[PDB]
Amino acid sequence: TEFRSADTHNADDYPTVAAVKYMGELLEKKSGGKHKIKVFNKQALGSEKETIDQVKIGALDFTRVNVGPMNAICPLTQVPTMPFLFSSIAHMRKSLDGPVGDEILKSCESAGFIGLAFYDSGARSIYAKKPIRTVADAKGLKIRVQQSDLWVALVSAMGANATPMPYGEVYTGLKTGLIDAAENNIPSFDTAKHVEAVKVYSKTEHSMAPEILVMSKIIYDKLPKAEQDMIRAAAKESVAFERQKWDEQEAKSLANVKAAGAEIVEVDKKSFQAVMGPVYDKFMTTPDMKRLVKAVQDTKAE
Ligand SMILES: O=C(O)[C@H]1O[C@@H](O)[C@H](O)[C@@H](O)[C@H]1O
Ligand SMILES: [Cl-]
Ligand SMILES: [Cl-]
Numbered sequence: 040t041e042f043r044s045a046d047t048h049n050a051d052d053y054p055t056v057a058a059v060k061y062m063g064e065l066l067e068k069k070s071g072g073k074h075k076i077k078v079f080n081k082q083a084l085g086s087e088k089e090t091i092d093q094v095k096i097g098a099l100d101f102t103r104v105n106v107g108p109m110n111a112i113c114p115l116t117q118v119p120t121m122p123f124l125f126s127s128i129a130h131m132r133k134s135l136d137g138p139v140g141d142e143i144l145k146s147c148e149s150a151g152f153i154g155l156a157f158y159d160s161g162a163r164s165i166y167a168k169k170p171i172r173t174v175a176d177a178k179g180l181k182i183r184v185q186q187s188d189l190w191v192a193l194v195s196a197m198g199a200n201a202t203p204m205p206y207g208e209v210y211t212g213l214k215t216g217l218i219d220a221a222e223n224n225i226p227s228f229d230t231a232k233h234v235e236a237v238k239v240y241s242k243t244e245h246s247m248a249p250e251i252l253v254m255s256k257i258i259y260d261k262l263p264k265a266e267q268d269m270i271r272a273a274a275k276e277s278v279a280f281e282r283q284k285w286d287e288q289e290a291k292s293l294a295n296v297k298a299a300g301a302e303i304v305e306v307d308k309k310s311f312q313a314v315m316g317p318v319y320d321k322f323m324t325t326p327d328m329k330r331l332v333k334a335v336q337d338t339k340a341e
């Protein structure tokens with residue numbers, strides 16, 4: 040069959056878009072040409088929230104979203120969203136590739152989603168019209184976040200005025216001053232054109248919330264076991280491809296925004312980490328969540 044998958048990003052070569060296209064190529068190979076994936080980027084099939092609901096009801100086969108908008112519907116996705124959980128991108132990758140990530144992926148089935156892969160999304164940092172070097176600088180800042188209660192809390196802990204909005208509304212919001220700031224990785228800051236509106240990128244690195252690729256359980260459950268396995272393998276094998284593309288995009292977008300006049304600022308990251316204890320207290324509240332946070336931070340470096 041020809042499966043459909045959604046992505047919000049406009050660029051046809053954005054790493055997440057390229058990665059699901061690569062997954063499709065692998066699936067064609069593994070299935071002897073039976074199965075294919077068509078990737079609808081440019082939010083053609085809806086916002087992240089909308090596509091999650093379409094996958095839930097089986098109208099859409101796959102969606103590639105960030106964990107943020109999955110925080111309510113698949114609560115263990117909150118774990119890798121948590122601020123300053125991971126010590127480095129290497130730590131994140133090892134954690135997500137191992138038993139922690141695999142358990143989180145499996146946990147979404149209870150809500151109607153087959154979790155297939157985590158893709159890299161770098162670290163998210165504040166961008167605004169002024170430098171945010173300490174948490175005091177963030178006080179009162181009108182900053183967009185994703186549609187997630189955890190995210191509202193995360194940024195509120197900095198003293199900021201968290202403003203949940205869909206991704207597609209952020210560019211115009213920044214241009215018109217409806218919002219002061221937002222937060223994201225550099226490729227998003229670049230490719231969504233947020234850098235056109237605000238130039239100061241303060242490296243708070245306050246989350247490494249990854250992307251998650253999910254399939255509709257309704258659709259998955261009707262496929263033969265052998266074909267379910269092909270899909271899972273193709274997704275898993277696409278992660279290494281996504282990461283190589285992601286590394287390249289990190290560099291390309293950094294060059295783009297520096298050339299465009301962005302001011303990249305180092306910050307007192309401990310200032311921001313020091314306010315996050317209550318976020319763990321208020322969100323990491325179940326045995327599974329506590330166990331998985333601990334497993335992540337018990338992970339040994341290579
Ligand atoms: O902030 C957002 O809404 C966006 O952030 C990006 O990092 C992510 O790649 C998008 O899928 C979307 O979640
Ligand atoms: Cl395609
Ligand atoms: Cl969106």
Ligand SMILES: [Cl-]
Binds near residue numbers: 183185221222
């Ligand atoms: Cl944001």
